[PDB]
Design an enzyme around this catalytic site. Structure first.
Site, PDB file in Angstrom:
ATOM      1  N   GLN A  59      -2.972   3.317  -2.484  1.00 23.66           N
ATOM      2  CA  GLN A  59      -2.104   2.760  -1.493  1.00 23.66           C
ATOM      3  C   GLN A  59      -1.925   1.288  -1.594  1.00 23.66           C
ATOM      4  O   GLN A  59      -0.914   0.761  -1.077  1.00 23.66           O
ATOM      5  CB  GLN A  59      -2.601   3.162  -0.106  1.00 23.66           C
ATOM      6  CG  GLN A  59      -2.566   4.670   0.066  1.00 23.66           C
ATOM      7  CD  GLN A  59      -3.057   5.102   1.419  1.00 23.66           C
ATOM      8  OE1 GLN A  59      -4.283   5.315   1.594  1.00 23.66           O
ATOM      9  NE2 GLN A  59      -2.170   5.223   2.357  1.00 23.66           N
ATOM     10  N   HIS A  86       6.375  10.725  -8.675  1.00 25.11           N
ATOM     11  CA  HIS A  86       7.399  10.566  -9.682  1.00 25.11           C
ATOM     12  C   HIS A  86       8.139  11.887  -9.991  1.00 25.11           C
ATOM     13  O   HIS A  86       9.328  11.868 -10.217  1.00 25.11           O
ATOM     14  CB  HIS A  86       6.833   9.910 -10.919  1.00 25.11           C
ATOM     15  CG  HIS A  86       6.568   8.468 -10.716  1.00 25.11           C
ATOM     16  ND1 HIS A  86       5.716   7.940  -9.734  1.00 25.11           N
ATOM     17  CD2 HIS A  86       7.088   7.408 -11.331  1.00 25.11           C
ATOM     18  CE1 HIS A  86       5.708   6.625  -9.825  1.00 25.11           C
ATOM     19  NE2 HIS A  86       6.504   6.261 -10.811  1.00 25.11           N
ATOM     20  N   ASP A 126       3.570   2.231  -7.072  1.00 21.57           N
ATOM     21  CA  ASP A 126       3.673   1.505  -8.334  1.00 21.57           C
ATOM     22  C   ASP A 126       3.241   0.013  -8.207  1.00 21.57           C
ATOM     23  O   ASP A 126       2.521  -0.477  -9.077  1.00 21.57           O
ATOM     24  CB  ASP A 126       5.085   1.541  -8.876  1.00 21.57           C
ATOM     25  CG  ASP A 126       5.385   2.851  -9.547  1.00 21.57           C
ATOM     26  OD1 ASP A 126       4.551   3.748  -9.693  1.00 21.57           O
ATOM     27  OD2 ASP A 126       6.581   2.947  -9.983  1.00 21.57           O
ATOM     28  N   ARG A 174     -13.932  -0.787   4.005  1.00 25.26           N
ATOM     29  CA  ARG A 174     -13.887   0.413   3.180  1.00 25.26           C
ATOM     30  C   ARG A 174     -12.711   0.308   2.221  1.00 25.26           C
ATOM     31  O   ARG A 174     -11.583   0.061   2.656  1.00 25.26           O
ATOM     32  CB  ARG A 174     -13.783   1.638   4.056  1.00 25.26           C
ATOM     33  CG  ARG A 174     -13.495   2.912   3.251  1.00 25.26           C
ATOM     34  CD  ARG A 174     -13.689   4.126   4.135  1.00 25.26           C
ATOM     35  NE  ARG A 174     -13.407   5.358   3.464  1.00 25.26           N
ATOM     36  CZ  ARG A 174     -12.394   6.170   3.674  1.00 25.26           C
ATOM     37  NH1 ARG A 174     -11.648   6.050   4.775  1.00 25.26           N
ATOM     38  NH2 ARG A 174     -12.140   7.116   2.811  1.00 25.26           N
ATOM     39  N   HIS A 229     -10.424   8.882  -3.483  1.00 23.49           N
ATOM     40  CA  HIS A 229      -9.412   8.883  -2.448  1.00 23.49           C
ATOM     41  C   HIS A 229      -8.126   9.496  -2.999  1.00 23.49           C
ATOM     42  O   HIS A 229      -7.054   8.910  -2.908  1.00 23.49           O
ATOM     43  CB  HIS A 229      -9.250   7.522  -1.816  1.00 23.49           C
ATOM     44  CG  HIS A 229      -8.671   7.556  -0.442  1.00 23.49           C
ATOM     45  ND1 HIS A 229      -9.386   6.984   0.640  1.00 23.49           N
ATOM     46  CD2 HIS A 229      -7.464   7.954   0.039  1.00 23.49           C
ATOM     47  CE1 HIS A 229      -8.596   7.074   1.693  1.00 23.49           C
ATOM     48  NE2 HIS A 229      -7.444   7.630   1.354  1.00 23.49           N
ATOM     49  N   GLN A 252     -11.508  12.787   3.130  1.00 21.43           N
ATOM     50  CA  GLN A 252     -10.965  13.852   3.969  1.00 21.43           C
ATOM     51  C   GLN A 252     -10.976  15.181   3.229  1.00 21.43           C
ATOM     52  O   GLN A 252      -9.925  15.654   2.771  1.00 21.43           O
ATOM     53  CB  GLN A 252      -9.542  13.540   4.450  1.00 21.43           C
ATOM     54  CG  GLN A 252      -9.486  12.307   5.309  1.00 21.43           C
ATOM     55  CD  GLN A 252      -8.160  12.039   5.967  1.00 21.43           C
ATOM     56  OE1 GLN A 252      -8.092  11.110   6.797  1.00 21.43           O
ATOM     57  NE2 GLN A 252      -7.121  12.800   5.705  1.00 21.43           N
ATOM     58  N   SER A 295      -8.001  17.756   3.378  1.00 18.59           N
ATOM     59  CA  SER A 295      -6.634  17.431   3.040  1.00 18.59           C
ATOM     60  C   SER A 295      -6.143  17.907   1.709  1.00 18.59           C
ATOM     61  O   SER A 295      -5.041  18.518   1.635  1.00 18.59           O
ATOM     62  CB  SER A 295      -6.463  15.903   3.071  1.00 18.59           C
ATOM     63  OG  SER A 295      -6.768  15.394   4.363  1.00 18.59           O
ATOM     64  N   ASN A 314     -13.217  10.296   9.852  1.00 20.08           N
ATOM     65  CA  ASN A 314     -11.909   9.763  10.152  1.00 20.08           C
ATOM     66  C   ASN A 314     -11.389  10.452  11.418  1.00 20.08           C
ATOM     67  O   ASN A 314     -11.573  11.676  11.525  1.00 20.08           O
ATOM     68  CB  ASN A 314     -10.938  10.000   9.004  1.00 20.08           C
ATOM     69  CG  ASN A 314     -11.247   9.248   7.753  1.00 20.08           C
ATOM     70  OD1 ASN A 314     -12.192   8.487   7.685  1.00 20.08           O
ATOM     71  ND2 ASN A 314     -10.413   9.479   6.734  1.00 20.08           N
ATOM     72  N   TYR A 365      -7.881  10.565  14.088  1.00 23.06           N
ATOM     73  CA  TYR A 365      -6.576  10.077  14.511  1.00 23.06           C
ATOM     74  C   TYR A 365      -6.126  10.757  15.802  1.00 23.06           C
ATOM     75  O   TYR A 365      -5.598  10.045  16.700  1.00 23.06           O
ATOM     76  CB  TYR A 365      -5.535  10.271  13.438  1.00 23.06           C
ATOM     77  CG  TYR A 365      -5.785   9.371  12.240  1.00 23.06           C
ATOM     78  CD1 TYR A 365      -5.291   8.064  12.219  1.00 23.06           C
ATOM     79  CD2 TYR A 365      -6.553   9.758  11.134  1.00 23.06           C
ATOM     80  CE1 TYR A 365      -5.447   7.259  11.145  1.00 23.06           C
ATOM     81  CE2 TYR A 365      -6.756   8.904  10.064  1.00 23.06           C
ATOM     82  CZ  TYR A 365      -6.193   7.648  10.103  1.00 23.06           C
ATOM     83  OH  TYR A 365      -6.288   6.795   9.026  1.00 23.06           O
ATOM     84  N   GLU A 367     -12.004   5.750   9.413  1.00 19.47           N
ATOM     85  CA  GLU A 367     -10.597   5.480   9.624  1.00 19.47           C
ATOM     86  C   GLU A 367     -10.272   5.823  11.036  1.00 19.47           C
ATOM     87  O   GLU A 367     -10.693   6.831  11.580  1.00 19.47           O
ATOM     88  CB  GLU A 367      -9.642   6.349   8.802  1.00 19.47           C
ATOM     89  CG  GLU A 367      -9.742   6.214   7.303  1.00 19.47           C
ATOM     90  CD  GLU A 367      -8.778   6.975   6.510  1.00 19.47           C
ATOM     91  OE1 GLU A 367      -7.703   7.441   6.991  1.00 19.47           O
ATOM     92  OE2 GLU A 367      -9.084   7.144   5.269  1.00 19.47           O
ATOM     93  N   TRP A 423      -8.015   1.834  10.251  1.00 18.43           N
ATOM     94  CA  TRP A 423      -6.980   1.992   9.248  1.00 18.43           C
ATOM     95  C   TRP A 423      -5.778   1.179   9.727  1.00 18.43           C
ATOM     96  O   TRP A 423      -5.365   1.473  10.845  1.00 18.43           O
ATOM     97  CB  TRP A 423      -6.576   3.454   9.086  1.00 18.43           C
ATOM     98  CG  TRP A 423      -5.660   3.634   7.926  1.00 18.43           C
ATOM     99  CD1 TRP A 423      -4.303   3.708   7.912  1.00 18.43           C
ATOM    100  CD2 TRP A 423      -6.060   3.696   6.550  1.00 18.43           C
ATOM    101  NE1 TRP A 423      -3.847   3.794   6.653  1.00 18.43           N
ATOM    102  CE2 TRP A 423      -4.930   3.793   5.770  1.00 18.43           C
ATOM    103  CE3 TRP A 423      -7.299   3.662   5.927  1.00 18.43           C
ATOM    104  CZ2 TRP A 423      -4.931   3.893   4.390  1.00 18.43           C
ATOM    105  CZ3 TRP A 423      -7.352   3.762   4.537  1.00 18.43           C
ATOM    106  CH2 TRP A 423      -6.171   3.901   3.804  1.00 18.43           C
ATOM    107  N   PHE A 460       0.789   7.739   2.217  1.00 16.68           N
ATOM    108  CA  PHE A 460       0.998   9.032   1.599  1.00 16.68           C
ATOM    109  C   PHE A 460       2.063   9.742   2.379  1.00 16.68           C
ATOM    110  O   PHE A 460       2.024   9.833   3.619  1.00 16.68           O
ATOM    111  CB  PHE A 460      -0.298   9.834   1.539  1.00 16.68           C
ATOM    112  CG  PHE A 460      -1.339   9.233   0.636  1.00 16.68           C
ATOM    113  CD1 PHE A 460      -1.206   9.259  -0.739  1.00 16.68           C
ATOM    114  CD2 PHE A 460      -2.521   8.663   1.171  1.00 16.68           C
ATOM    115  CE1 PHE A 460      -2.168   8.772  -1.567  1.00 16.68           C
ATOM    116  CE2 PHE A 460      -3.494   8.175   0.326  1.00 16.68           C
ATOM    117  CZ  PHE A 460      -3.320   8.219  -1.042  1.00 16.68           C
TER     118      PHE A 460
HETATM  119 ZN   LIG Z   1       6.890   4.362 -11.343  1.00 16.81          ZN
END
Ligand SMILES: [Zn+2]
Ligand SMILES: *[C@@H]1O[C@H](CO)[C@@H](O[C@@H]2O[C@H](CO)[C@@H](O)[C@H](O)[C@H]2NC(C)=O)[C@H](O)[C@H]1NC(C)=O
Ligand SMILES: *[C@@H]1O[C@H](CO)[C@@H](O[C@@H]2O[C@H](CO)[C@@H](O)[C@H](O)[C@H]2NC(C)=O)[C@H](O)[C@H]1NC(C)=O
Ligand SMILES: CC(=O)N[C@@H]1[C@@H](O)[C@H](O)[C@@H](CO)O[C@H]1O
Ligand SMILES: CC(=O)N[C@@H]1[C@@H](O)[C@H](O)[C@@H](CO)O[C@H]1O
Ligand SMILES: CC(=O)N[C@@H]1[C@@H](O)[C@H](O)[C@@H](CO)O[C@H]1O
Ligand SMILES: CC(=O)N[C@@H]1[C@@H](O)[C@H](O)[C@@H](CO)O[C@H]1O
Ligand SMILES: CC(=O)N[C@@H]1[C@@H](O)[C@H](O)[C@@H](CO)O[C@H]1O
Ligand SMILES: CC(=O)N[C@@H]1[C@@H](O)[C@H](O)[C@@H](CO)O[C@H]1O
Ligand SMILES: *[C@@H]1O[C@H](CO)[C@@H](O)[C@H](O)[C@H]1NC(C)=O
Ligand SMILES: *[C@@H]1O[C@H](CO)[C@@H](O)[C@H](O)[C@H]1NC(C)=O
Ligand SMILES: *[C@@H]1O[C@H](CO)[C@@H](O)[C@H](O)[C@H]1NC(C)=O
Ligand SMILES: *[C@@H]1O[C@H](CO)[C@@H](O)[C@H](O)[C@H]1NC(C)=O
Ligand SMILES: *[C@@H]1O[C@H](CO)[C@@H](O)[C@H](O)[C@H]1NC(C)=O
Ligand SMILES: *[C@@H]1O[C@H](CO)[C@@H](O)[C@H](O)[C@H]1NC(C)=O
EC number: 3.2.1.147
Lengths: 499, 499
Positions: free
Chosen positions: B37, B54, B68, B93, B139, B185, B188, B326, B328, B407, B455, B463
Site C-alpha cells: 500500500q 494489473h 505501482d 506497524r 501482508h 487478517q 481475508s 484488527n 473496524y 488496526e 490505520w 485494497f
Molecule cells: Zn503497473
C-alpha cells in the site's frame, strides 16, 4: 534504373514516384506491434516487463511509464483492426502475451481460456478484413513466475516451457495463422537484459549497474543467447514436425544494423566493422545457418561461449523457413579494447569495437533518428542505404533466405503537442527513404523479400522510454486512448499502399 | 466508572477527558501501514497484488489505481518516521514485502541485499526515535512466482517457502524487531482471494465470477485457510526454537468483528450470530487455541474441511505469544440458506448467516463507516462498543491472550478536496470513540491489551478501492507524494498521545 536518396531532403513521399505497385503484386505491406506495448495488464498474469518497470521505474522510461494500460488494445483491438482496414494493409505483426494465455508460465498449470479467446477474436477480425497475421510468440514478455523460478532464459528449463507454450499457440491459432515469429530480436535480451540491464529482467555485473539484483554481464549474455537459439530451434522443430498440416512458415526475428568503417582507409576500423557483423549478426545467424558460432566469437569469447552438442547443432542449423528482419539504423565501427579481466566487462565489449554515427572525418551518417536530450553527442542518425546493404548481405552471406521486414520506423518526441505529433513528416521521410532502398535491393540484388511491416501501428509504450516518444503511424491521446487517428505518415502510407 | 458514547455526537475528542494517560504507562500508541500500500514497486520483484491489479484493473479500485508508486515510502520512508516522531508515537506497524527481499520467492534463489538494507534503515530510524516496530511478515503481497509455480497458499509448498522467508527476516532484523506478525487478517485471503475473488489472487468458481482464471469458492477457502495456519505455525515454531535469544514475541493477525442478532428475540437470528462467531473468528482461533476447527464448522463443512494430523494440531495449538487484533466494525446476523450443491456456492455461505448493519426493527448499528455510492443500502456503519465486546470475548473464550490492536480506522472519500480531507472530524470521532471503549474494557474486564495502532499512518493505496478513499491520519497529495501532512485527526492523536 532506380535512384534512391540518402540525405535530406527526400522526395520519395510522392506516391506518383514510389508506391506499392513499384513492388511485386504479392508483396505484403502493413504495420507491427507487440503485446506488452499495447494491450495492458487487464486479463493477464504478470511478466518480467511488468516486474522490471515496477521494480526499476527509472529504467522504464524518463516518465516512469509502463505497459499497465497503454493504448488498451485489450479493449480496443477492433480499433487496431480499423486502422489496418483504413490503410488497406495486407499484413499485421502482433505478439501473443505468454502471460495472457498461460499466466502461470508452465502449460500444465492451466490455460486462460479468456486469453485464448482474445487472440481468436483478433485473428478472426484480421482475416475478415484480408489482413495476414504475422504472430510473434515471444516479444520479451516472459511470465514473471519463470524468471523467479529459474531466471528465465538463463536456465535450460526455459526450453521445454517455451515449447509447451508454442505448442498451445499452434494448436489454438495455427489453423488461421500462417506466419509465426519465435523470439523478437535475438540480440536484445542477452545484451540489454543480461549485459547492460537496460531491459528486463535487469541482470548485470555489480559494477556495471549497482541496481541490478544479480548477474554477470560477461557470461550471462552468452548463456541467454544460447538458450534462446535452443528454445527457438525446439519450437521450429515442433512446428515443422507436428504442425506441417497447417501450411504455415516460422522464423526468428533478428535486429539488423549495417556497419561501416569509422575510417574506411584504416585497416583497424575495417577489421572492427567486420567483427561487428560477426558479433551482432553472426552470433545468431552462424548458428541458424551452420550450427556454430562465428570463429571470431569462438576465439575471442573462449570458455564463456557455450558449445552446441552435435544434436543441438543439427536442431539449430536451418531452423527457419524465413527470417523476420527488423532494421532501424547503421553504425560506424572503430577499434576498442576488450578488458576481459575488468569487473565491468560486458559481452558487448568482446567485439572490440566502438560504435558511432559520425565518422573520422566528421560526417554524420544520415538524418536525425533519435535526439538524446541529456547528451546530444549520443544522438542517433539513420542511413536509408543500410536496408539495402543488410538485405544484400543476408542474401550473400546467409544462403538467400526468404525475408520479411518485420519492423522499420522512427520516433517523434512525446513533448510535441498533438498537431505537431500528427504532422509527422519526418516519419514519412524515414519510411519512404527505406522503402525506396528496399525496392532497389529487391530489383538489383534479387533478395527474396516478400513483405514490409512498419513500426508501429499506433503510439504505444516504448521499451525504455515510456510515453516520452511516439512511433505510431496513428496517434493516441494518452488522456483518452480509444481512438487511433492516422497521422500524416499513416495517410501517406494509405496512399502508398493504394495509389 | 467509565461511560462511553455509542452514537453521534461524540465528545471523546476532548483530550481533557480521554488521553494516553487514561491507559497504563507502558501502553503503546501508534499507527500502521503495509508494504504494497505504501512502498511502490521500485526496487522489488512482482507480487500477486501487482498481478491482480494489473490483470483485473476494475477489481483494483474504481479508479483502476494500484500500488505501482503510491506514496513512495521506498523513497520517503524518512518522512514516515517524521510523522511518527511528530505524533510522539511509541509504535509503528509496517510490513516487509517478501518480493523486496526475496524477489524470486524461494530463498535459495538469492536475496536482494538492497531490499534488506531498505528495511534495516527504516528499523534503525524508528528505534532512534523511540518507536517500537511491529513487523508484519506477510501482508498479502505474495511473490508472483510462487502463485504461478504452485498457486501460492493453495499448495502445501507454501509452508517451507514462507518459513525460509521468515527465517531470513528473523536473521536480518530480529536483533532490533521484537514484535512480529505472521500473516495479516487470516480470514481475508481465503474468502476474498479464493472465495469471492475480490482480492488477489482472484480465484473463484466460474459462476461466482466468470473473470476468475481458475478456482472453486466452495473448497479453496478452506484449503488456503488451512495452509495459512500451518505456515503461520511453522514460522512461530521456527521463531521460538531458533530465535529465542532475540527476546521478542510473535503472533498472527486476526480481522475481528462483533456480531449481534438481527432480531435479539428470535432464536434463529441468535443462532446465526453464534455461528458467525465460530465461522469468522473460530475458524482460526479454534486451531490457534485448541488445534481443531470449531465443531459447527466440522459438521457443516464436512469433507471440504481439512484435518490436522496430530503433529500439525500440536504445532498450531498455542502458536502465538500475542494476538494482533484488527477491528473496524460489527454486523447483525440473521439466518440464510447454505446451498452447498449450487454451482455458485461459496465457503462464506457455510455459516448460514446474512449480515447487515440494520436490525429487524430498522435500527442502524451506529454512525456511517463507508458510503457505497452504487448501492446505499450496502453502506457500512460502525459500532464503537464492538471493540469492547470483541476484547471481552477474546479474553473469555480464548484463554486471556496478550493483545495488541493492530488496526483500527476509517476512510473519508477521495472525492473530497484537500481542505475537506484535512478536516477529518469523522476520523477523530471514530478513533476516539473506539479508544474510549478500549480503555473501558481494559479497566472493566481486565483484558490484556498493551497497545493500539491506528490505520493508517498516511493516505495510501486501499485494497479494492484504489485512491478513491483515504485512511490516513496524515494527508498525501497524489500529484506530489513527498509530504505527509497531519490532518485534524493526526493533530488530535498527537494531543491524545501527549496531552
Ligand atoms: Zn503497473
Ligand atoms: C566519412 O564519410 C564520408 C561520406 O561517406 C566519406 O567521404 C566520401 O569520401 C569518398 C571517397 O574519398 C569521396 O569520393 C566522397 O566524395 C566523399 N563524400 C563526401 C560527402 O565527402 C569519407 O571518406 C569518410 N571518412 C572516412 C575517414 O572514412
Ligand atoms: C434493534 O436494535 C435496537 C437498538 O439496540 C433495539 O432497541 C432497544 O431494545 C431494547 C430492549 O427492548 C430497549 O430497552 C431499548 O430502549 C431499545 N433501544 C432503542 C434505541 O430503541 C431493538 O430491540 C433491536 N431489535 C431487534 C428486533 O432485535
Ligand atoms: C497510381 C500511381 O501513381 N502509380 C505509380 C505509377 O504510375 C509509377 O509508374 C510507379 C513507379 O514505381 O509508382 C506507382
Ligand atoms: C516436438 C515434437 O516433435 N513432437 C511431439 C511428440 O513428441 C508428441 O508425441 C506428439 C503428440 O504429443 O506431438 C509431437
Ligand atoms: C479502398 C481501397 O483502397 N481499396 C484497395 C482496392 O481498390 C485495391 O484493389 C486493393 C489491392 O491493390 O487494395 C485495396
Ligand atoms: C493533560 C490532561 O489533560 N490529562 C487528562 C487528565 O487530566 C484526565 O484526568 C484524564 C482522564 O482519563 O485524561 C487525561
Ligand atoms: C524450525 C526449526 O526448528 N529449526 C531449524 C533447524 O532445523 C536447523 O537445523 C537449525 C540450523 O539451520 O536452525 C533451526
Ligand atoms: C514533544 C512531546 O510531546 N514529547 C513527549 C514527552 O514530553 C513525554 O514525556 C513522553 C512520554 O509521555 O511523550 C513524548
Ligand atoms: C535510479 O534507480 C536506481 C534504483 O533502482 C538507483 O540505483 C539509481 O541511482 C537511480 N538513478 C538516478 C539517475 O537517479
Ligand atoms: C569501467 O567502464 C566504464 C564504462 O564501461 C569506463 O568508462 C571505466 O573506465 C571503466 N573502468 C575501469 C576500472 O576500467
Ligand atoms: C474518449 O474518446 C472517444 C473516441 O473519441 C470518445 O467517443 C469518448 O467520448 C471520449 N471520452 C471522453 C471522456 O471524453
Ligand atoms: C470488469 O472486468 C472483467 C474482466 O476482468 C469483466 O469480466 C467485467 O465485465 C468488467 N466489469 C464491469 C462491471 O464492467
Ligand atoms: C447464485 O447466487 C447469487 C448470489 O449468491 C443469487 O442471488 C442467485 O439466486 C444464485 N442462483 C442460484 C441458481 O441459486
Ligand atoms: C513537491 O512537494 C515537496 C514537499 O512539499 C516540495 O518540496 C517540492 O517542491 C514539490 N514539487 C513540485 C514539483 O511542486
Amino acid at each position: 534504373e532506380i535512384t534512391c536518396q540518402e540525405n535530406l531532403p527526400f522526395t520519395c513521399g510522392n506516391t506518383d514516384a514510389l508506391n506499392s505497385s513499384s513492388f511485386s503484386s504479392d508483396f505484403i505491406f502493413g504495420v507491427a506491434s507487440s503485446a506488452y506495448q499495447i494491450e495492458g495488464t487487464i486479463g493477464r498474469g504478470l511478466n518480467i516487463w511488468d516486474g522490471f518497470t515496477h521494480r526499476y521505474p527509472n529504467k522504464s522510461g524518463p516518465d516512469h511509464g509502463n505497459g499497465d494500460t497503454t493504448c488498451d488494445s485489450f479493449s480496443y483491438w477492433q480499433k487496431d483492426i480499423d486502422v489496418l482496414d483504413e490503410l488497406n494493409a495486407t499484413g499485421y505483426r502482433f505478439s501473443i502475451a505468454w502471460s495472457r494465455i498461460i499466466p502461470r508460465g508452465k502449460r500444465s498449470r492451466g490455460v486462460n481460456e479468456k486469453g485464448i479467446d482474445y487472440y481468436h477474436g483478433l485473428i478472426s477480425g484480421l482475416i475478415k478484413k484480408g489482413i495476414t497475421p504475422f504472430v510473434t510468440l515471444f516479444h520479451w514478455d516472459l511470465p514473471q513466475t519463470l524468471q523467479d523460478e529459474y531466471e528465465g532464459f538463463l536456465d535450460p528449463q526455459i526450453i521445454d516451457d517455451f515449447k509447451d507454450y508454442a505448442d498451445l499457440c499452434f494448436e489454438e491459432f495455427g489453423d488461421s495463422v500462417k506466419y509465426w515469429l519465435t523470439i523478437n530480436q535475438l540480440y536484445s535480451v542477452p545484451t540489454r537484459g543480461y549485459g547492460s540491464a537496460l531491459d528486463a529482467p535487469g541482470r548485470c555485473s555489480p559494477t556495471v549497474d549497482p541496481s541490478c539484483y544479480a548477474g554477470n554481464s560477461s557470461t550471462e549474455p552468452y548463456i541467454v543467447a544460447h538458450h534462446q537459439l535452443l528454445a527457438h530451434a525446439k519450437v521450429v522443430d515442433l512446428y515443422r514436425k507436428n504442425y506441417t498440416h497447417q501450411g504455415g512458415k516460422i522464423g526468428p526475428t533478428m535486429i539488423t544494423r549495417w556497419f561501416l568503417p569509422y575510417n574506411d582507409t584504416d585497416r583497424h576500423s575495417i577489421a572492427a566493422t567486420e567483427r561487428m557483423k560477426e558479433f551482432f549478426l553472426g552470433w545468431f545467424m552462424g548458428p541458424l545457418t551452420n550450427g556454430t558460432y562465428p570463429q571470431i566469437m569462438i576465439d575471442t569469447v573462449g570458455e564463456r561461449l557455450p558449445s552446441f552438442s552435435p544434436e543441438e547443432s543439427n536442431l539449430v542449423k536451418g531452423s527457419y523457413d524465413f527470417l523476420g528482419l527488423n532494421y532501424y539504423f547503421t553504425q560506424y565501427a572503430q577499434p576498442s579494447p576488450n578488458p576481459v579481466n575488468s569487473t565491468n566487462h560486458t559481452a558487448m565489449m568482446d567485439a572490440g569495437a566502438k560504435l558511432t554515427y559520425i565518422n573520422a572525418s566528421g560526417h554524420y551518417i544520415g538524418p536525425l533518428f533519435e535526439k538524446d536530450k541529456a547528451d546530444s553527442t549520443d544522438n542517433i542518425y539513420y542511413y536509408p542505404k543500410g536496408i539495402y546493404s543488410v538485405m544484400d548481405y543476408f542474401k550473400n552471406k546467409y544462403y538467400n533466405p526468404l525475408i520479411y521486414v518485420t519492423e522499420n520506423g522512427i520516433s517523434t518526441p512525446g513533448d510535441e503537442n498533438r498537431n505537431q505529433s500528427m504532422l509527422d513528416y519526418t516519419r514519412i521521410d524515414y519510411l519512404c527513404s527505406h522503402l525506396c532502398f528496399l525496392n532497389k535491393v529487391i530489383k538489383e540484388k534479387d533478395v527474396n523479400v516478400k513483405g514490409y511491416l512498419a513500426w508501429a501501428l499506433g503510439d504505444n509504450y516504448e521499451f525504455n522510454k515510456g510515453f516520452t516518444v511516439r512511433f505510431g503511424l496513428s496517434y493516441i491521446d494518452w488522456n483518452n486512448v480509444t481512438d487511433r487517428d492516422l497521422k500524416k505518415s499513416g495517410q501517406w502510407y494509405q496512399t502508398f499502399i493504394s495509389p
